[model samples]
Target: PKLGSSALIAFLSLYSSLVLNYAFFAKVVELHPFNGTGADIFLYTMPVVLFFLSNFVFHVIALPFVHKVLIPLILVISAAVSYQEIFFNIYFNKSMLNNVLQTTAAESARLITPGYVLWIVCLGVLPALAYIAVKVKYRVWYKEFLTRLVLAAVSFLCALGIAMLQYQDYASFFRNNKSVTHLIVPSNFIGAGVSKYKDWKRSNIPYTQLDMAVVQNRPAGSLRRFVVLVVGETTRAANWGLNGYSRQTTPLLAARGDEIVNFPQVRSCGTSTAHSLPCMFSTFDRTDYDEIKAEHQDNLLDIVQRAGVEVTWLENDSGCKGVCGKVPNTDVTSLNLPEYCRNGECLDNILLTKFDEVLNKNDKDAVLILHTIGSHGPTYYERYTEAERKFTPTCDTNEINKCTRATLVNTYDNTVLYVDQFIDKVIRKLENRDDLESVVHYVSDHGESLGENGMYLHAAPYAIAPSGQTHIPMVMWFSKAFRQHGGIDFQCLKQKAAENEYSHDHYFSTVLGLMDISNSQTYRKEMDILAACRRP
Candidate 1:
């Protein structure tokens, strides 16, 4: 029997939902909504259409009970898709959904607003309501299910065939494009959730973890050393003025004059804080670093703390990416410092407000890790104050793509400028503390993309990741006494900083070297920049 025109009408109904949400899908896949080459749009969008088409075909086959469940599921998924698209302009990928799993209630609220809810209603709820109201006649239920499955298979095959026709173009772009699945909405989150759960399950394997064997016993009468490790957010090197960026984004740090060593050629282990923070601190470097291996093992902080150094982690960003779970920790956002705080959010400088008092209390050599909310965007404007709006005509909203590229850059650069101030202030704190040798090392957990080549924020796959997402700025400011007590030659470090190419791979070993804590088993002398400059 020939399929009735009613099936096509039902297909058309589902297609309308896809079209209603096309703005998000089109932008994610880099398609112009109205003005694109037809062939180009066809190749890029085929996978997404087939996704919904397959689901609609299955819907055609289901009994009324399954249909009842399917309609509500579709409506809920559509609402979620609309909420993500209209508010964040972000796609739901494994890293993205994984981000959701880890996000706190305070963080989640930032993505939902009155306007955000309204847009979801207009775009998703209206179309989904219409979809629920549409009626389909059921006939020879088993036979129809078989026929619909065949049709769905053929339609999916046609999608693949079309993609294969433009094999060179589609295979290169759509196949490799990580964000393409996100355009398919329900399938985006569903597929990503499955992938995320697998990684989580593997990473959650319980094991008794141990620290690297400490080789050098603390020599008698060794001066105590204090280290301040700042884990920054979304701060890229390309925009850092000390890294030779034209903008004066780091005026305060620039004025430090050879005291701070700026590492220009540094890249992060991962493009997301969730991965990078843990990866950087783990004994394993980027390539050898497995999420599973990292979660089950002890990290640098644990190693340092066990070696008789008192360690404290102060977080201003999202919780220290689980790096500080076992360590002495403080969520600075919980503090009520009215000067630096507003509306449940504080400036990056809040990490240092009570730091001086905290430092004096601990008699032991201490390590303070300040996880700054540095340059986390597309809300770049919120990251800085009026004083730091040194860059003009900033993009003040999350809709960064709508702004001029120059304006967006200015907004991001302003955040960097504010970060410069915060880092400088920390240096001042260290400078004032002449009792203990103090040093502050600042490294961004990852970088961000500001509409570069149509990529907005970070969390892209490492293989095809752009420089904007991976290249990060790492700066170290040592107090004069820190250099003296550690037997470090400043001139030698400057030379090494200039000549050496480094990544987050070196972070673990170098931190060990900085603390003068030598690891017997896992230590690589070549990886530590300070290994060459210090006395044995």
Candidate 2:
């Protein structure tokens, strides 16, 4: 039951490189087929290189306590990561790790299916238990230190030798597929964890104020402005009926006709809500987005609130990801309305529960953000009510991988159908507010991949991410009063919405433009989607 620390570390590293990294090796083989050439040999030598590199890492932390706790913990976590990689084709980059870390208890619960639990029990828990049961015997302090140093040096040198053997091939392969590095077990998640920690430390910095004297420009005789920003979750433009899909998933929104402006070619900032929600609200575009900087700065809500517009976030999704931290916000999930909520989670319709009250209380020209849990998977069937289940023979289970692609798509489309109904209801409420010049702007945080190229769900690292995960749907519905009083040429916006491609980068400035906060330093005229359509 006892083994030397170095021996245990070596065993763990070998086991990790060979046994735990099945998906990594599979992906490598899939990308570069075996031809028995030197290049092919180089690709196959990855395990040897990984073994040594992981050995070096294990030797660095070869303490008795770490051997018992950390080693077993790493084994379990790596096993879990491997399972996800094998099944979902997920790449555990920093953003993906951030998404995992920020996922709510309810959201996390859906991922823990019987198969997932069984996988962990067999590959993760059993191995971890065996490792934990083994007692690590350490040598005398000086001797142990010298042994570790020698092992580390040898491991590093061996790995370096193998890596440099086919440097050209290795460099070319990795250069073309940068995200493949994130498929490697232990190191990928470990590096991401370190990066996330650094981001957390950076987020502690003081908040940066974008603008102080922001003001909303409203002409005399204009009605009080009411702008509703509906932040959709996991919905894609490809599935939207308004966006030219063969299916009428968005029939309700389609019925609105001229009142709605559908923007089909809209890209999300990130494939996950943890990344996109904050990035969209921040001044940073997708290219320049820094989570730390976004966290410690004034977002759209802040500047809009500064303009004396009553800003409130009504959340039915996991959260606003700190985008609504500075503004008045309500988590509709917590309301536990029997009609719209169940099992600690609420339907997207829950966002509309207090819509009337929220509007009635807002005497000032206001911006209300309704963050809906739209089409969030792998329980897409749960998102919609029985009445909203228009799609036939849908996948009703949480284990999405087990379902047929057609059934899965059916379930997902049903969720989109529900969103259409939810959005139409929102517009109906806004239409009732004739006293207020109202507008409802809707855009998804990101898209989902329903068995596309063997990839399910999302967060597949931006470099390797497919269009299914990035191409989101955006829509704008302006009331007749909003068009007249808010100085927007509806026809112009309708034309622009069809012709121009947009991204989450436009969200911050465009909202400001919509609310008539034109004079602010934070408002970027060029980035505003509505600025060109504004009537002189």
Candidate 3:
């Protein structure tokens, strides 16, 4: 079909506003129900408003080759975006885009399915191919420019006139639901992409070093300190047995009641690993954290290593989100351990295997970080072995939403059970090494949502994120030697842990204080969990 450029642009704009934005329209309707009022009329006019606004945008960028490429490209991309929004109930803000950009190949593969592929093919590929096949006829240069200008002006005015009819209602609705803007197709993701790109550009700034005059204030006869910092993934407080869950999901940790201190009231810095992982390790608290600045600055690992404490990160999860870039780190998945690893991914047990190898190499006071792939979904069944499946009738498929709530929770609980075993093993490893004063501290990067409020998985914008995604589990175990050597009162620490509220804010200062980096300029006594519990 041969059509003039202006007609083609108008058709594409209408197509995008209607076909490509199904999720956006669905969300808008779900949010603002059709009450018999002027507000209802205003809500109905949204599509018309979107059409003209899209038309105006299309006209502004309607160059011959650019229009042919950009319009179809947007349609294809928007289809994939819409699928995720409709299916997973995700909001693609800057933080969510960071997760998408940083996701590993194995992790990304878990999200793909036959339904997702079909959605892309039917809604995205077919339309894009059809658009590409169309022949666009352009007028003379001067005439084309004039036509675009007139079309753009007409589109802008039409949209403006319709919007002004119930401007106050529209303003009020949007103001109350600020995150609703993220539901808009193409524009929301495009804005997020641009914002993330700006952050990426700023990340190129020169690295800043902290005070190098670091020293550990160990007692005269204290044994060499060994701290195992276990970073957990997507394990929430609500489901943790230590946090008063009905089921004994964390039976192993629960049995070691006197040995471990579980911080039940802990909140995460962010709802996703891409945001929380780096924030947890940085000097800045959640309120003060800036990703670009944090990336360029020295973190907890750097400061600890500078104090001559050997720091090695053993990664079983995705890479440490740049937290261990400057420190000696190993990706456990790369080792391809036959027992614990399969298909370029490894279980949390692989970190335990690598832990022994790395422990042998360190002769002095050391910090070993085990970044575990604990309870990460929607493949929760894969996280634990058949023996670890304590909960029966599990959800076995990657299509988590398709499963019954009972089955989904059952599968998730099994992962928690496995983590309980994994953490207990880590503590057992530390305990056997009576030669060194050892401590094992575990904290999850963020929490997960199990079909709560129709939201699955994490990484909703922080402002509107649910407790299921923000409330994380943090547990710590101090060996008898570690407590005696560091003058840490176990009873006092347990009382304080139970009573006090903590977040990722306490992580940096708490680790420093645990390692006894007392003289470090960056260490804050007020932020340290052990400061009050330590006997002089």
Best by TM-score, which number? 3
Q: In candidate 1, which residue ranges exceed 4 Å CA deviation?
A: 1-13, 16-67, 70-91, 113-118, 134-136, 160-183, 200-204, 212-216
Per-residue lDDT, model 3, residue 431, is 84
* Candidate that beats the other on TM-score, 2 or 3, i.e. the better one: 3
In the predicted model 2, the residue pairs found to clash are none
lDDT, candidate 3, at 169: 75
Per residue, candidate 1 scores C-alpha lDDT tens digits across 1-536 of 22332474345445544554554455644542335666556536654555555555454544465664565466556676655553334566776776777777655565555666776676557655655666655558787667666666666576677666767765566556646557565566667878877886667567646654674465677666788888889999999999899987999989988898999889999888888888998988788987777877888888877766788988898788778888888888988688877656678877877687768866777888888889987577889889989888989876676788899999999999999999898888778666668888989988998886666777776766789889999989888678767778888988888888899889887777766665545557888878888775
C-alpha lDDT score of every prediction, in listed order: 0.74, 0.87, 0.87
Could you tally the backbone clashes for each prediction?
A: 0, 0, 0
Model 3 lDDT per residue over 1-536, tens place:
65555687778888888887777778778888887865677767889999999999878765778767887788888888888888788887888788888989988898888999998899888888888888877788898778889989899999999988778877887898899778777787888999988877767789899968998777677788888999999999999999999999998888887888989899999999999999999998999999889988899999999988899999888788989988999888898877877766788987887778777885778999999989999888889999888888999999999998888999999999999999999988878777778889999988999997677988888888899989999999988787667778889988888998999999999889877775688988999999888888
Question: Where does candidate 2 stray beyond 4 Å?
Answer: 2-6, 36-38, 137-145
lDDT of 2 by residue, 69-135 (tens): 7877888898889998988888888888888888889898988888899988888888888788777
TM-score of each: 0.87, 0.96, 0.97
Model 2 has an lDDT value of 0.87
Candidate 1 Cα RMSD (Å): 4.1
How much is 64 displaced in model 2, in angstroms? 2.3
